[PDB]
Each structure stands twice: as structure tokens, then as C-alpha cells.
Amino acid sequence: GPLGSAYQLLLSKETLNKILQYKQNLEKGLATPGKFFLEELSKQEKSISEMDITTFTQLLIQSKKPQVFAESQVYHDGTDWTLEEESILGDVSVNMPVTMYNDGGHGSSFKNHPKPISGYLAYVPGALLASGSGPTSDMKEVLDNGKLNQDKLNALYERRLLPQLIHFNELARQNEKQAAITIPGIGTGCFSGAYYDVIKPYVRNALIHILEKHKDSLPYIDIIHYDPYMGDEPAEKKIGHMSFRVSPSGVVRGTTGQLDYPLGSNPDTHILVSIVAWDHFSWPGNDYWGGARQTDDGVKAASTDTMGQVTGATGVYDKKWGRYMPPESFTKDAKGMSDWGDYVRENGIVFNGPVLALDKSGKLDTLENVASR
Ligand SMILES: Nc1ncnc2c1ncn2[C@@H]1O[C@H](COP(=O)(O)OP(=O)(O)OC[C@H]2O[C@H](O)[C@H](O)[C@@H]2O)[C@@H](O)[C@H]1O
Ligand code: NA
């Protein structure tokens, strides 16, 4: 079979149901794919009905582009993606082991790790409440006549984050360690739209609700370091056995960065995981495919070997600028037209890896297996 993939795509049981309904609607001629999904379908040979659910899902995920800003560059009307596709893509997360080269500070605030540290990233798209065009799938889902609904937002983040929490619980267990997870203010910046001034407490409440509800499934998760940067009160509380900390590093001096061990954890006792505020439509690291070390997604990708994990190439970390650069051979000359998205174009890289679903018993399994049982 294929070579091992450094990255793994996960999704919830409810997202699998949406995928099955979509696949069946296409098979019956009730749905039209978006043009980008159609483009990826046309590069393989199978009809929708002949391909299986995992291949079908992979091809939809493959329609993502290296850099695309959901808040401003998407129409939601089939000329790019449809709302039915967007509902699915927003639920898909991706994890990968990484080397972390700095603590994740934005701009020039980053602090280099003397020795690069090992851990993991889990890219998860936030609730998309911004658009340069019409309303989004997430807006339809979590707003009632324009008002945010906490219970509906809770269910959305539950769908999106629980598969990764379950994954890293099991990974901590099999590594005979506990998990420390750093989390940013997902959805509270570029994705917040008109809700910028009110969204922050909703996200913190959603995280607390998911951890309270599922604590029995997360015995190897130990520390949750939630850093909304600004706009939430510093706090520490116990959620069952788990230490949940609200540590906004934009207002409090001397907080640990997203790509660093929170207080109480170290490499011998914990695996280190950071959630990344991702994008429905882009590859992990979005902005930084275009050379921009900007936003949680672009900063964390640039500050790790994310792009090496996705492309398979060996990049070179630049200490002065806090960013993992393309291979020296690619950068040497090239007219400076040599960022990672340029690398993708000339080497025909695609984003496509293994995908698993979280079944109703709390086990990650193949789409085929979950759908049948
Ligand atoms: N200087 C800073 N240092 C640290 N955190 C900061 C800083 N400035 C803002 N934050 C916090 O960073 C947190 C994350 O805000 P965002 O990165 O916009 O994420 P989203 O989920 O809303 O938008 C996702 C889109 O943005 C990307 O392009 C993706 O690819 C998507 O296209 C917030 O708490 C900020 O307050
Ligand atoms: Na609740």
C-alpha cells in the first residue's frame, strides 16, 4: 500500500452521517458537487457509487487549497464549494507529530527553543461566523435569528474537538504518559465577524462543557492550557481530574507559549499537543503557504515542521525569522518566488491522507466500519 502518512484526518460520527447523506444525494442525482470537489473527482477514474466512503471523503478533503481564507475568499455557492461541502469540511480535523522550533509567539515575540522540542498539532476549524459573501453553514447552525446559541455552539465544538481529544488520550496511554494540551481562542479572531466583541466567553464555555461532559473518556488528559490571548479572565479550575487554565498571554506577563510545556508538565511525564485554529478550505498552515507567518494557523505551521510533514520535503528552520523555510535547493535563486505554496505547485503535492471517524462507543475506526455498525 501507500507509504505511511505523517498526518491523520479525523471526524465525528455526526460528520460521517453528513458525508453518507451527501454521497447518497450525489448518487441519486439530488446534489451537484462544487466545482473544486468536481475537479478532484475528475483526476481519478471511479464514479461516486463505485468509490467507497473513505475515498469519497479523502477526495473532498483534497479539494482544499494550500492557502485560502474562509473569512473573505469563498462564495459558498458551488462555484467553489457548496454549503453541504462546507458543513463537512469544517468538521474535519488533522493531527501530526511535529518538531517545535519556538514557543509560538506571533510577530517577533517568539522565543526560540534552545533544543527544538517534540509534540503534536491538531488542526481544527473554528465556527465560521465571517464571510465576504453570503451566510455560512456555521452561521446557519449556531445563530438563531442572528443571536449566538451556546448549546448549538457547544455541539459544534464537541463534534470537531472530541475526536482529537480521544485520539490523544489513547496516544498518551500507549506512550505511558499524560497529555498536556494548549488551546488558542479558536474562532475568536478572523472567523468571528460581527461577533468579535461577544464570542470569547462562548468558546471558553464550549471547551468547559466538552471537558465536563466527556471527562470519563479522557483519563490520560491532565492539563488544558487555554490561551485566548486577550479578553478572558485568568483562572484555574479542576474539571474532574483535569487542570483547566485560562491564561491569556497578551495581558499576563510570563505565560508559557502554545508551543511549550505548560507549568506542571515536562517531556518525561507528558506528551505536548497544541490545537490549531484551522480553515474549512485550506491545508494546515494556510497563511504560511503564501509565506506569511500570521494567525494561529500560519504561526504554528511556520514554527514547526508542519510543512515538511505535509510535503515530505526537509525544510530548514530560520532562527532569525522564526520560520521553517523550504529546502535550500528550492530557495537558492528562484527569484524569491520560493515559498511553500510555490513548492507545492512545482512538485504537484496534494493534501490527502488516512481518515478515521469517532464511533458512538468512543473508538476511532474506519469510515467503512463506523458506517456499518
Ligand atoms: N499577537 C497575537 N499573539 C497571540 N495570539 C493572538 C495574537 N493576535 C490574535 N491572537 C489570538 O489568536 C486566536 C486565534 O485567532 P485567529 O488566528 O484569527 O483564528 P480564527 O479561528 O478566528 O480564524 C481562523 C482563520 O484564520 C487563519 O487564517 C486560519 O487559517 C483561518 O483562515 C484568537 O484568540 C486571537 O485573539
Ligand atoms: Na453545559
UniProtKB/TrEMBL annotation:
<dbReference type="GO" id="GO:0030430">
    <property type="term" value="C:host cell cytoplasm"/>
</dbReference>
<feature type="domain" description="Macrodomain effector MavL">
    <location>
        <begin position="7"/>
        <end position="330"/>
    </location>
</feature>
<dbReference type="GO" id="GO:0005576">
    <property type="term" value="C:extracellular region"/>
</dbReference>
<dbReference type="GO" id="GO:0072570">
    <property type="term" value="F:ADP-D-ribose binding"/>
</dbReference>
<protein>
    <recommendedName>
        <fullName>Macrodomain effector MavL domain-containing protein</fullName>
    </recommendedName>
</protein>
